[PDB]
Amino acid sequence: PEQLASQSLLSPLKREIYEANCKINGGFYKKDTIVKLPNSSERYKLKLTKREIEVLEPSVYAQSYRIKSSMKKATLLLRLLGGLDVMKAISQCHFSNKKIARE
Amino acid sequence: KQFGFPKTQVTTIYNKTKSASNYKGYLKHRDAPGMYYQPSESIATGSVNSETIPRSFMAASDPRRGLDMPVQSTKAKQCPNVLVGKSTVNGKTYHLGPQEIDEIRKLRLDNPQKYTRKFLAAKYGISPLFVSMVSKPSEQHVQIMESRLQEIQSRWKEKRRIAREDRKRRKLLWYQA
Amino acid sequence: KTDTTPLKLSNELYAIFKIHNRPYLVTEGDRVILPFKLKQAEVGDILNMTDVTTLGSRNYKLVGHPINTSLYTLKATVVGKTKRAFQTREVTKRRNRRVRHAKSKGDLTILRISELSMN
Amino acid sequence: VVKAIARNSIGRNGVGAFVFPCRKITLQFCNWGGSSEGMRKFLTSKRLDKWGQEFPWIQFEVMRKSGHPLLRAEYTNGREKVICVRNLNIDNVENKLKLLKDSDGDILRRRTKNDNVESLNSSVRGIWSPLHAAKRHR
Amino acid sequence: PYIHVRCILRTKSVTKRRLAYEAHLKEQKRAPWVQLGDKPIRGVTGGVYKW
Amino acid sequence: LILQCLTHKSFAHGSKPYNEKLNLLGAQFLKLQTCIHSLKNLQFSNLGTKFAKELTSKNTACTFVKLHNLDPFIFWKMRDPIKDGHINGETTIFASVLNAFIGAILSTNGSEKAAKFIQGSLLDKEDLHSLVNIANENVASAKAK
Amino acid sequence: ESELAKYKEYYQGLKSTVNEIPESVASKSPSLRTLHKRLQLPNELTYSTLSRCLTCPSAKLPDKINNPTKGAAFVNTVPTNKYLDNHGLNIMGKNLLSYHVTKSIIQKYPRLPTVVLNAAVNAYISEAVLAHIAKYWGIEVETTSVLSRYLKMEPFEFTLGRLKFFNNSLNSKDGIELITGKNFSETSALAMSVRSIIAAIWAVTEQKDSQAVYRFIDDHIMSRKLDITKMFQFEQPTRELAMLCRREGLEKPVSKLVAESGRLSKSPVFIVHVFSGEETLGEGYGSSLKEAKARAATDALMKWYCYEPLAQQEPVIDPGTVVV
RNA sequence: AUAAUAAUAAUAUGGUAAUAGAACAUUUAAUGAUAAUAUAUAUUAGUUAUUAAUUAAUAUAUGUAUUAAUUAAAUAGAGAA
RNA sequence: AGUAUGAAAAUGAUUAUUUUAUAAGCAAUCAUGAAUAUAUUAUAUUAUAUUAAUGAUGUACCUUUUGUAUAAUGGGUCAGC
Ligand SMILES: [Mg+2]
Ligand SMILES: [Mg+2]
Ligand SMILES: [Mg+2]
Ligand SMILES: [Mg+2]
Ligand SMILES: [Mg+2]
Ligand SMILES: [Mg+2]
Ligand SMILES: [Mg+2]
Ligand SMILES: [Mg+2]
Ligand SMILES: [Mg+2]
Ligand SMILES: [Mg+2]
Ligand SMILES: [Mg+2]
Ligand SMILES: [Mg+2]
Ligand SMILES: [Mg+2]
Ligand SMILES: [Mg+2]
Ligand SMILES: [Mg+2]
Ligand SMILES: [Mg+2]
């Protein structure tokens, strides 16, 4: 199904705890915050590993098709598109001189 | 003078100037059996050792008091003062009365810019700390100068901000002892 | 004729004592690690040190070879007998295929200085 | 003014009372397998009774499981040592049992030369200070 | 040769803010520089007083 | 030491000796003595009773010292000089004074003598001014209200 | 022949033996005897009393049992008897430990400020330290289910030698860890066990030997290391030292430069002394005159507060904390 | 009058070519319980004086061992062509 | 050149921790600071693991030779044989 990692990998209660923790904490998990569950009087303190922290945050995974090129040729542009915003990277690929940029 | 032990120092059979840290010399040294007096070559800044407690801080009943351990090697005549207060150099004075203290308050609340702490101190022959003690500035004045501090802080760069936090932590570490 | 009042009147004391001539400098509660296996004393037993060389405070010290036992009291408690970490070395020559493995796991005995004071 | 920094005391076994490091030992044997013959005959050779009488502060457990024979010793500090005594006789099993009993459970470690005293106490004679020293340099 | 290019895109409103928080915490945890710092006396004790 | 026990921290801005450590140590010792008293007068079930709590409560000590007329010898600072002294927190001051006496006895004369003193004149049933009597009055008042 | 009836019989028997704690059954518990010998408890402290110390006041189960889906399951313990739990022993141990530790710390350091004294008492007898002492002693918590103990037919002498209380199965499973009161915390239960053991030692020993609860406390608690110097944090020690000298009969403290090297450098060294007349009250070092002055004042204050009197001395009662 | 383990005194323990004892990993044949609360494999961290096995956690497969042990045999051990 | 499975290595890109732009050689061992990670007895003044501050020591391996770091032979690496 088309849904995020937090929605696909967590049980309902753990999802509610995690979402409430992120909401109270500003949008992301923090180690120790007793969270209050809505329409209930019970409180929780979720505990996660850094792998869980990284995997539960929103993200999208894109894969290309079979591209006719070399890794040494792709790296020349993938090292430029390092941590740029996607819109900026799209512009750079639009105005690059390399055949890999279209793909 | 109370104890007449022979005086000795940590000895090395090797050369202390060139082999200060070689432990074999200290190990192989041999002192004659008996009591000795060898002073500690350390500063007593963070110690609570009975041998370092000053006499005035010990109970009179303390037998350790009569004995002359915390040797007064240094003499206060030749050591110059450090960051000393003016009153401590020439003692404190108690000469202002209620009426002029009240008028000091009125001036401070009237024109804090014109009647500053140093100005009042000069006028009335007191200390700026005393001026702050007796008087109190205006809320507008304190607000504007807090805002000035905020502006100065905001104009800082990353390195100066980190350096100031470091200064704060270091100063806090001064007093832990 | 050995006056010891300076060491009597002291809230902290240290002692240098020798086991099999190896010296150890300890204070009340320290943890000594003898690099050998004590077969005379079993775990939980108490050792009375009778080869103390020096007893010292911040500014005074008593030296003896050894010091008289009556003056002081130094007792240790054996807390465990264990071993070092296992190591293996390859002893071999420059153009020899044969390698001989020399394996080492020594023995240690842990002591806790239970009481150190001057009587 | 004075404030306090919260602290917690550090235990010192042997300074007051001594608590024996070894708390429990478990002898696991198998009724099938020649690797457990030594453990079986040790268990039936009137020796475990002597061990219990000699060390009444250790809890001895005897268990059967399919596999190689084991000796499981759990200590006060929370750690645990397991020894497989496969294909050992009564005396060698006893030697392993003595080894487990006669040791603290600390993780085996490598030490440097002359690293034989560990202290929590501050130095009676404070650290050397060049300004406060009997002989001034040059 | 044929290759493939893969990408993982994240959000500035979650990941970057969390990373900034963690970096801030590390900065606050960083120890200060003391001119006469209590640098440990490295080396074994030896069983004798050298001072 | 008696004067130190009868002087509170609020007097002379703590320049002269005062009783805080004595208060704490006496409070702990008296609590232990009252716990053993509840045990003896074996059964570990009377340690949380309202009588047990009131036996050490501050009001009990304040009333005890008032009836024992040790008030005029106590050094402390009246918050508002002319008004009912109840509002001025006198219960705490005098409870502190009594606990200070307990602690001073314990520190100077010893645990055995302190226990004898606390189990004697204090904490008695046939004194009519003892902490026990005051506790019965207080529990009776609580029952009435 | 139903197995449910056999389980009912087992549960009833377990409840009865936990309600009565008979010595005939408790004396067969290897855990209790091993713990007894390990701690060298008095020979007249009954194994039933030790098991009473281990058991906790778990009489009525909570309503959160009805909702395991909400993150809490309690299927490990049986109701206890209101007259055979360890509540009173816990209270008595609290009293004894507080009194003894406070007295010991005071008599060692007569001049400690109240805040530092409280901090040290906590450092010695806090809940965490007591829980660590329990686990170090070997007090182990019952985590298995009564049904599992029935399935493997476990004698009750094994359960009687385990710490028992309403403990939440599912505590941190899947990283949830629903919060609860202290009545469902293992740390508090372990501390309760230690305090109850202290109380039982006293209860059995006071008559013949008034002491030996105090000796046990010195052995297992006051033997622990604690550097009192690491519990201080001053703000304005110059002002505090001036006030202290004024309160005493000492001449005003003036700070003076004793030695200096490396001025006009990254890391200079200044040695300053706070003299009260001709007598040095504090020695400070620093990379700045201000640092050295502060360190000297703090050193003088600490020498004063942490002064330790000899055991042979007439008792020292301090005039109270220096209040400015 | 042995075997195992331990204790004391004494002697000995570098090694190419070479000689002589002992043991371990892999596979196959004979005998051979147990079982998903188990077995096998892999990674990380511990234990046993450690080319090997074992304990814990995690991952995959499997209602499961040519299993522990004793024998008999090898297409039985590779940085060197 | 069967099917299924396949975190086997060599090899490539990226991320994370750590060190690295005044320092020189088989790249490793020991000594020793510092950062980070994990830890349901870290009670801590704790333990372990990873990491080119810094110091000392250190002339790859086989073959064949009286004798080789030798600028004498053989080897790009790994898996299988
Ligand atoms: Mg030299
Ligand atoms: Mg070689
Ligand atoms: Mg050769
Ligand atoms: Mg040979
Ligand atoms: Mg030889
Ligand atoms: Mg072959
Ligand atoms: Mg190969
Ligand atoms: Mg090889
Ligand atoms: Mg080849
Ligand atoms: Mg550089
Ligand atoms: Mg180079
Ligand atoms: Mg030739
Ligand atoms: Mg050569
Ligand atoms: Mg070359
Ligand atoms: Mg070559
Ligand atoms: Mg070639």
Short mmCIF file of N, CA, C and O in Angstrom, two decimals, chain B residues 86-117:
data_model
loop_
_atom_site.label_atom_id
_atom_site.label_comp_id
_atom_site.label_asym_id
_atom_site.label_seq_id
_atom_site.Cartn_x
_atom_site.Cartn_y
_atom_site.Cartn_z
N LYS B 86 37.98 49.08 47.44
CA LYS B 86 38.47 50.35 47.96
C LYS B 86 38.24 50.45 49.46
O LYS B 86 39.11 50.91 50.21
N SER B 87 37.06 50.02 49.93
CA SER B 87 36.79 50.04 51.36
C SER B 87 37.73 49.12 52.12
O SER B 87 38.14 49.44 53.24
N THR B 88 38.09 47.98 51.52
CA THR B 88 39.03 47.08 52.17
C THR B 88 40.42 47.70 52.26
O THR B 88 41.14 47.44 53.23
N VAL B 89 40.81 48.49 51.27
CA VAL B 89 42.09 49.20 51.36
C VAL B 89 42.02 50.26 52.45
O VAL B 89 42.93 50.39 53.28
N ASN B 90 40.94 51.05 52.46
CA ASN B 90 40.65 51.97 53.56
C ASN B 90 39.22 51.71 54.01
O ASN B 90 38.28 51.88 53.23
N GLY B 91 39.06 51.32 55.27
CA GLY B 91 37.87 50.66 55.77
C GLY B 91 36.54 51.33 55.48
O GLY B 91 36.48 52.45 54.96
N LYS B 92 35.47 50.62 55.81
CA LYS B 92 34.12 51.04 55.48
C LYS B 92 33.72 52.26 56.31
O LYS B 92 34.30 52.55 57.36
N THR B 93 32.71 52.97 55.83
CA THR B 93 32.20 54.16 56.49
C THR B 93 30.68 54.11 56.53
O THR B 93 30.04 53.64 55.59
N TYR B 94 30.11 54.61 57.63
CA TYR B 94 28.67 54.63 57.85
C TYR B 94 28.31 56.06 58.23
O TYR B 94 28.30 56.41 59.41
N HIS B 95 28.02 56.88 57.22
CA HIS B 95 27.87 58.32 57.43
C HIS B 95 26.64 58.93 56.79
O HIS B 95 26.30 60.07 57.13
N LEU B 96 25.96 58.24 55.88
CA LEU B 96 24.76 58.79 55.28
C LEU B 96 23.55 58.52 56.16
O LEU B 96 23.49 57.54 56.90
N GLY B 97 22.57 59.41 56.05
CA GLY B 97 21.36 59.33 56.84
C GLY B 97 20.13 59.15 55.98
O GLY B 97 20.18 59.18 54.74
N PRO B 98 18.98 58.97 56.64
CA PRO B 98 17.75 58.67 55.89
C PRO B 98 17.38 59.72 54.86
O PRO B 98 16.93 59.36 53.77
N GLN B 99 17.56 61.01 55.15
CA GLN B 99 17.08 62.03 54.24
C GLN B 99 17.87 62.04 52.94
O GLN B 99 17.30 62.07 51.84
N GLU B 100 19.20 61.97 53.03
CA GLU B 100 19.99 61.93 51.80
C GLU B 100 19.90 60.59 51.10
O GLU B 100 20.01 60.53 49.88
N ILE B 101 19.66 59.50 51.83
CA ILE B 101 19.41 58.23 51.15
C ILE B 101 18.11 58.32 50.35
O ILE B 101 18.05 57.88 49.19
N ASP B 102 17.07 58.90 50.94
CA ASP B 102 15.81 59.07 50.22
C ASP B 102 15.99 59.95 48.99
O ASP B 102 15.46 59.64 47.92
N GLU B 103 16.74 61.05 49.13
CA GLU B 103 16.94 61.91 47.97
C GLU B 103 17.79 61.22 46.90
O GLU B 103 17.59 61.46 45.71
N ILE B 104 18.72 60.36 47.31
CA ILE B 104 19.43 59.52 46.34
C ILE B 104 18.42 58.69 45.56
O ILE B 104 18.50 58.58 44.32
N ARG B 105 17.47 58.09 46.26
CA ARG B 105 16.44 57.30 45.59
C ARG B 105 15.66 58.16 44.60
O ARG B 105 15.39 57.73 43.47
N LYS B 106 15.26 59.36 45.01
CA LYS B 106 14.51 60.23 44.11
C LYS B 106 15.31 60.56 42.86
O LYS B 106 14.78 60.51 41.75
N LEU B 107 16.59 60.91 43.01
CA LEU B 107 17.40 61.21 41.83
C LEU B 107 17.50 60.01 40.90
O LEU B 107 17.35 60.13 39.68
N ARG B 108 17.76 58.83 41.47
CA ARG B 108 17.90 57.63 40.65
C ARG B 108 16.61 57.34 39.88
O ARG B 108 16.65 57.05 38.68
N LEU B 109 15.46 57.44 40.55
CA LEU B 109 14.20 57.21 39.85
C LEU B 109 13.86 58.34 38.90
O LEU B 109 13.05 58.14 37.99
N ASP B 110 14.44 59.53 39.09
CA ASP B 110 14.12 60.66 38.23
C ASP B 110 14.87 60.58 36.91
O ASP B 110 14.26 60.48 35.84
N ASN B 111 16.20 60.61 36.96
CA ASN B 111 17.03 60.67 35.76
C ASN B 111 18.16 59.66 35.90
O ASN B 111 19.29 60.03 36.25
N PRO B 112 17.90 58.38 35.63
CA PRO B 112 18.98 57.39 35.74
C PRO B 112 20.13 57.67 34.80
O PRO B 112 21.27 57.29 35.11
N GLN B 113 19.87 58.30 33.66
CA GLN B 113 20.95 58.62 32.73
C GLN B 113 21.88 59.67 33.31
O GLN B 113 23.11 59.52 33.29
N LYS B 114 21.32 60.76 33.84
CA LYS B 114 22.14 61.82 34.40
C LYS B 114 22.73 61.41 35.74
O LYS B 114 23.92 61.65 36.00
N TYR B 115 21.92 60.80 36.60
CA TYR B 115 22.36 60.39 37.93
C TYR B 115 22.66 58.89 37.89
O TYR B 115 21.85 58.05 38.30
N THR B 116 23.84 58.56 37.39
CA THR B 116 24.28 57.18 37.32
C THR B 116 24.82 56.73 38.67
O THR B 116 24.98 57.52 39.61
N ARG B 117 25.10 55.43 38.78
CA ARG B 117 25.63 54.90 40.03
C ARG B 117 26.96 55.55 40.38
O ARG B 117 27.18 55.93 41.54
#
